[PDB]
Design a protein around this nucleic acid. Structure first.
Ligand SMILES: [Mg+2]
Ligand SMILES: [Mg+2]
Ligand SMILES: [Mg+2]
Ligand SMILES: [Mg+2]
Ligand SMILES: [Mg+2]
Ligand SMILES: [Mg+2]
Ligand SMILES: [Mg+2]
Ligand SMILES: [Mg+2]
Ligand SMILES: [Mg+2]
Ligand SMILES: [Mg+2]
Ligand SMILES: [Mg+2]
Ligand SMILES: [Mg+2]
Ligand SMILES: [Mg+2]
Ligand SMILES: [Mg+2]
Ligand SMILES: [Mg+2]
Ligand SMILES: [Mg+2]
Lengths: 147, 203, 210, 102
RNA sequence: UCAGUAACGGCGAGUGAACAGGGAAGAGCCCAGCGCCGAAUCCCCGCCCCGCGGCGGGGCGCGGGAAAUGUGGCGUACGG
RNA sequence: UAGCGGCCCCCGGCGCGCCGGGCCCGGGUCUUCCCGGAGUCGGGUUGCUUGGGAAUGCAGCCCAAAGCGGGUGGUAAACU
RNA sequence: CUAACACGUGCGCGAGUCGGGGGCUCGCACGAAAGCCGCCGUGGCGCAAUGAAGGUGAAGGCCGGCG
């Protein structure tokens, strides 16, 4: 609202909060990002290093869909299925292990970060990591690849 | 039929037979005037292919267009401005000579509708095109269900709006990754759609 | 001029953007008009489905979405022929048909055939002449219960199959999935060069023997 | 052992049976028909050969094969078209030589 | 929405799409050619009958013309 | 003003019936035949244009096709 | 005034959050509002970073079993 803005409190002060020595002129330093290498060089180097120059290869017809690969972590791994699944597996005595499919829930690669509760799991995914594999093996379980 | 033979003949333009013919015709056409009605198609097969039918209401005009490019119409040089726009005599027109010929025929015959056109000969300084026109108010076409589309008012001056086969080629119309400039109606439409702000009601 | 600290910005307002501005003040009126046209067409086609022709099952054509199932443009001729539907009669009895789509697999073809057979079993066909029915027609008593249905006909569902919890055997507990992926990548990368090396080794051995 | 389908490798991809079918009739275009061959050979017989074609035929007759290929490529365009044209001209020369001998 | 992204740019200032995905809407078709049908096709003038304020339908004309340098029916890549 | 309020006039659209006119029409299997658009594609160069980068698109000039061919598969080239 | 960004503040929900586009609501004084969608969360931002790229991708500490 215009009621609460600084302009209302600024009426009557000739200057309008912009100084008498240096006025409020149009474009004292140039428009936009001008002088990035000449008279704004200090600011550009101090606050945006690496701005100027080229690096890396050019990929012309990039399609993000080819590289689409969402990831999940082992601490979140048990949240894909319902709690009743996990508790039933926990108090089960036959040794059967529930099957968790991350592709069904929309994940492609499993990365092993969190601690895993001690019960067998059949994790089926598209890609695995070495540490996630070893975590699943240590907790007791199976890793299954799907396409 | 004989058409297939004719077509395969005309594809052999470097053969001595066709070369001699083309020479003789080109001489005759150059001797004639710049725009005149031909009694009958020179290429019956090509007229057939493009849509001509040997019935009343179909007329054919043979026309010649001066060859070459397009030099900038500026007083001496004097294309005042930055050096990037200093070019005078190496520029090229955006439309083809076939399209220019069709538009000239359509302008001269304002009561007819342009259907298509084809190449019949050329030389160093001229190109010769025969263009098919249709009289839209002749009963022979107004009573024929499949050709009465051209009698609609929407199809006035197709060559002037770039709707004929020759005119369309210059618009960059197509499907696929080669023709992204004309997604939508045309270049105008694509540029408009890409260069407006969609200031929604809520934002 | 840059202030103390912040982001470098590239606003795309260096053209005459104020002349080409699309305000949306007609959005509610547009919605009202589209609705009215929708109900007008629904009334126009009296017993027919409001949504339109049934459509087929298709898989999204990308690694990002190939797990999902869409509604396609139309049934293809292979599916129509194996379901016993004429390509010309399908359109007039309510089946969307396109001739561009192929059929690389068999599961999708069989699924769409099942869909078409279910649609034939479900639709009610009115007499071509209201007085005298014909052989390929529906009897009179169920015509009294013919009504429009809202939404797409037989809507598409993404159904996920559970298998029950299994018991582990030692056979799949010794499977080195990460190692398998790494060697698969290596073999795919080095397949061609290995073939060329084998070829030149073979020709060198032949030369040495000869 | 275990052979799980994988997203990578030589046999990457979800497994599915692939059904054989008659190829689309659109793929048939360009196939040479007996009547079309008859027409084209009649037209060739009445017309003759282009000047560049006969120059290349002279080059092949004097057996400068690389020169013929380079000249045809320059005169016509792509290397594939050049190779096809050279093969057809060599076939024509062989037929002419056989007819002259017999 | 992808996306101020892939990319272009004294690679500086700046410029800059598309595919996929969700929706609004949704509708498909016709020639030339290749062939088969006694040109089986079309326009116009005269007379008779109908209504004619969007000049049409039927019949009779040893009436005229177009058209074989190709009109009409079947038929077009989904095959015929 | 409100009202699935009233009265009168005119035009339309949907159904029904009558006369006249045209129309003789489809599906499956087997056998035999047939099937395509040229100064166009494409190449070189020049100029403009594009995010399109050893040339996205357009145009002028020169060269200029093929039929298991031709186009596309976002880095030029040969083989596959 | 519009757009972008940064930071500070107030409110709702919270590892989630957000219908802005569309649709359903006998369209219509207000109402062009408001309500609803949940198998309309497509999608955006966040939940993972790093490398030019191929790619890889986030603890471990004690005893019995061959210091
Ligand atoms: Mg003061
Ligand atoms: Mg100052
Ligand atoms: Mg000072
Ligand atoms: Mg200022
Ligand atoms: Mg221009
Ligand atoms: Mg072209
Ligand atoms: Mg300052
Ligand atoms: Mg973003
Ligand atoms: Mg610089
Ligand atoms: Mg620009
Ligand atoms: Mg899309
Ligand atoms: Mg819809
Ligand atoms: Mg014909
Ligand atoms: Mg430019
Ligand atoms: Mg490449
Ligand atoms: Mg600041």
């Amino acid at each position: 609202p215009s009621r609460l803005r600084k302009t209302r409190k600024l009426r009557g002060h000739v200057s309008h909060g912009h100084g008498r020595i240096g006025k409020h002129r149009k474009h004292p330093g140039g428009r936009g990002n001008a002088g990035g290498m000449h008279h704004h060089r200090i600011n550009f180097d101090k606050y945006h290093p690496g701005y100027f120059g080229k690096v890396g290869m050019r990929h012309y017809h990039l399609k993000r869909n080819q590289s689409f690969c969402p990831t999940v972590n082992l601490d979140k791994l048990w949240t894909l299925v319902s709690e009743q699944t996990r508790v039933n597996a926990a108090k089960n005595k036959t040794g059967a292990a529930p099957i968790i499919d991350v592709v069904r829930s929309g994940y492609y690669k499993v990365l092993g970060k969190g601690k895993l509760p001690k019960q067998p799991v059949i994790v089926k995914a598209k890609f695995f990591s070495r540490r996630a594999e070893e975590k699943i093996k240590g907790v007791g379980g199976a890793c299954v690849l799907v396409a | 039929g004989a058409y297939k033979y004719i077509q395969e003949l005309w594809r052999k333009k470097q053969s001595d037979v066709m070369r001699f013919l083309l020479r003789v015709r080109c001489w005759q056409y150059r001797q004639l005037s710049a725009l005149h009605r031909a009694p009958r198609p020179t290429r019956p097969d090509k007229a057939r292919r493009l849509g001509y039918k040997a019935k009343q209401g179909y007329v054919i005009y043979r026309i010649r267009v001066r060859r070459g490019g397009r030099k900038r119409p500026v007083p001496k040089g004097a294309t005042y401005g930055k050096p990037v726009h200093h070019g005078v005599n190496q520029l090229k027109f955006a439309r083809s000579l076939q399209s220019v010929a069709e538009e000239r025929a359509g302008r001269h015959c304002g009561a007819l509708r342009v259907l298509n056109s084809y190449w019949v000969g050329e030389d160093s300084t001229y190109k010769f095109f025969e263009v098919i026109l249709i009289d839209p108010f002749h009963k022979a076409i107004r009573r024929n269900p499949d050709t009465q589309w051209i009698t609609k008012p929407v199809h006035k001056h197709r060559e002037m709006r770039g709707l004929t086969s020759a005119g369309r080629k210059s618009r960059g119309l197509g499907k696929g990754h080669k023709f992204h400039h004309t997604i939508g109606g045309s270049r105008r439409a694509a540029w408009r759609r890409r260069n407006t702000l969609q200031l929604h009601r809520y934002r | 001029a840059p202030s103390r600290n912040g982001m470098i910005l590239k606003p795309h307002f260096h053209k005459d953007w104020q002349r080409r501005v699309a305000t949306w003040f007609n959005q509610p009126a547009r919605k009202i008009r589209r609705r009215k046209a929708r109900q007008a067409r629904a009334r126009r086609i009296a017993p027919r489905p409001a949504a339109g022709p049934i459509r087929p099952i298709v898989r999204c054509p990308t690694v990002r979405y190939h797990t999902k199932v869409r509604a396609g443009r139309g049934f293809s001729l292979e599916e129509l022929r194996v379901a016993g539907i004429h390509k010309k009669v399908a359109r007039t009895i309510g089946i969307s048909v396109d001739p561009r789509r192929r059929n690389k697999s068999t599961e999708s073809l069989q699924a769409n055939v099942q869909r078409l057979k279910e649609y034939r079993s479900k639709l009610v066909l009115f007499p071509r002449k209201p007085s005298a029915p014909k052989k390929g027609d529906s009897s009179a008593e169920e015509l009294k219960l013919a009504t429009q249905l809202t939404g797409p006909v037989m809507p598409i569902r993404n159904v996920f199959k559970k298998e029950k919890a299994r018991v582990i055997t030692e056979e799949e507990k010794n499977f080195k999935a990460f190692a398998s992926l790494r060697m698969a990548r290596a073999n795919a990368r080095l397949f061609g060069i290995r073939a060329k090396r084998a070829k030149e080794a073979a020709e060198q051995d032949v030369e040495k023997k000869k | 052992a275990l052979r799980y389908p994988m997203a990578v490798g030589l046999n990457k991809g979800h497994k599915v049976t692939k059904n054989v079918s008659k190829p689309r009739h659109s793929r048939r275009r360009g196939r040479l028909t007996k009547h079309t061959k008859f027409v084209r050979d009649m037209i060739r017989e009445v017309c003759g050969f282009a000047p560049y074609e006969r120059r290349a035929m002279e080059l092949l007759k004097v057996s400068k094969d690389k020169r013929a290929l380079k000249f045809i490529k320059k005169r016509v365009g792509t290397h594939i078209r050049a190779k096809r044209k050279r093969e057809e001209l060599s076939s024509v020369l062989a037929a002419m030589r056989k007819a002259a001998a017999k």
